[PDB]
Curated annotation (Swiss-Prot):
It comes from the Eukaryota. Residues 28-44 are perinuclear space. Component of the nuclear pore complex (NPC). NPC constitutes the exclusive means of nucleocytoplasmic transport. NPCs allow the passive diffusion of ions and small molecules and the active, nuclear transport receptor-mediated bidirectional transport of macromolecules such as proteins, RNAs, ribonucleoparticles (RNPs), and ribosomal subunits across the nuclear envelope. Due to its 8-fold rotational symmetry, all subunits are present with 8 copies or multiples thereof. Interacts with NUP188. Present with 3410 molecules/cell in log phase SD medium. This is Nucleoporin POM152. The chain holds residues 105 to 214 of 1337 of the full protein. It comes from Saccharomyces cerevisiae (strain ATCC 204508 / S288c). Residues 66-68 are cytoplasmic. Functions as a component of the nuclear pore complex (NPC). NPC components, collectively referred to as nucleoporins (NUPs), can play the role of both NPC structural components and of docking or interaction partners for transiently associated nuclear transport factors. POM152 is important for the de novo assembly of NPCs.
Length: 110
């Protein structure tokens, strides 16, 4: 029943929060927990993008979209535009900036 499904989801959440309160009592008593997962930056990248790419590719069929038909003027283009324009501008600016607003100073000091 929908009543029992809701109750089971709330019980499973309460079990997770009870385990969190236990690990918190360990944390506040100064006892060793073991990080989050691992200290290898590469495994962190692989696991982070495994979750993100898998979630995107798993949910993408659920939209049932076969569907490349926008009304006259609709998205993605705007995001690309302003955003990258700004990016490039900033980059060039920064480059020139460093070039004549730092390097020169260093030379003078020397």
């Amino acid at each position: 029943e929908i009543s029992k499904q809701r109750t089971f989801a709330v019980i499973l959440f309460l079990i997770i929060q009870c385990y969190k309160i236990y690990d918190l009592v360990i944390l506040k008593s100064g006892l060793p927990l073991s990080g989050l997962l691992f200290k290898n930056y590469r495994f962190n990248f692989i696991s982070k993008y495994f979750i993100i790419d898998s979630f995107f590719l798993y949910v993408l069929p659920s939209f049932n979209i076969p569907r490349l038909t926008f009304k006259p003027w609709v998205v993605y283009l705007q995001i690309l535009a302003m955003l990258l324009l700004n990016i490039f501008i900033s980059s060039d600016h920064e480059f020139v900036l460093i070039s004549l607003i730092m390097t020169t100073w260093r030379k003078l000091y020397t």
